[PDB]
Amino acid sequence: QKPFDKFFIDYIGPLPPSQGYLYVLVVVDGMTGFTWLYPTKAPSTSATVKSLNVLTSIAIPKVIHSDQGAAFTSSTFAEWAKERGIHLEFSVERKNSDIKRLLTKLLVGRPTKWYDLLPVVQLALNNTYSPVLKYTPHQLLFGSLLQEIRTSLYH
Amino acid sequence: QKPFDKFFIDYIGPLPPSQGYLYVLVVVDGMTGFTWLYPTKAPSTSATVKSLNVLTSIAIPKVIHSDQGAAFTSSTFAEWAKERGIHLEFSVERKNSDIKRLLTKLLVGRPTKWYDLLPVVQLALNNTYSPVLKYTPHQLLFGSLLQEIRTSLYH
Ligand SMILES: [Mg+2]
Ligand SMILES: [Mg+2]
Secondary structure, three states, rough: OOOOOOOEEEEOOOOOOEEEOEEEEEEEEOOOOOOEEEOOOOOOOOHHHHHHHHOOOOOOEEEEEEEOHHHHHHHHHHHHHHHHEEEEEEHHHHHHHHHHHHHHHHHHOHHHHHHHHHHHHHHHHHHOOOOOOOOOOOHHHHOOHHHHHHHHHHH | HHHHHHHEEEEEOOOOOOOOEEEEEEEEOOOOOEEEEEEOOOOHHHHHHHHHHHHHHOOOOEEEEEOOOOHHOOOHHHHHHHHHOEEEEOHHHHHHHHHHHHHHHHOOOOOOHHHHHHHHHHHHHHHOOOOOOOOOOHHHHHOOOOHHHHHHOOO
């Protein structure tokens, strides 16, 4: 019902090494579909916690939903969530597919440069319209590269 | 005139080591007074760039204002800003004083634990009223621990 009520989280990667980064932590807000992308060296509990402490400095989600990935099912992650009163669920898929498709296209001719281009992927994702919705994720949350990205998202 | 038009940035630290973190990058939005706090190991250009890439994934500021700190005056930082079309200025002070005062009080009895408490400092800062303004920074941006913090901010 509210932004920041529920996060859906997942790892994408590995990608070609880029400034030592190999993975992207994907966080999708349930209500708005707003996506945060965090580059990490590993798909680990500690990188997940690092990124999510940054995000939860804005607001604390009631629920976090993920898959059974090792980053998410550790007792360290469980402890972190319990300390904050966060309910963890395990088992938006369209959103995650979109992101993967975006990343693949952007690697072409420049595989080591994805870290630098990452902020523009996120900007693109949050300022593009979904098939059935009338507003962008950015609008819902706050009340050439860009062209190529929009190609993948709109076609 | 707009949120994300201008950032004011600065380093606070060093603080007692906490999960390997020694410093806090402080980013204050000019229009809303909204503050982001990023923990770093060093007051460096690379930690500044890492944190600001995360933030500029939301929107790209027109201007960034800082002091003459080495993190900010390097040609690496200058290059990063020019690539994004960001105008750098060198030479809110009340805001930064508030934060320092907050951090000092929170160290007492628990100096190594500041990293874990950092998100609550930011939450507190953005969801507290300023002396002359009618809205919190959070409201402007989005359209016991907490009690102790509010003590420092309101007294
Ligand atoms: Mg997965
Ligand atoms: Mg300074």
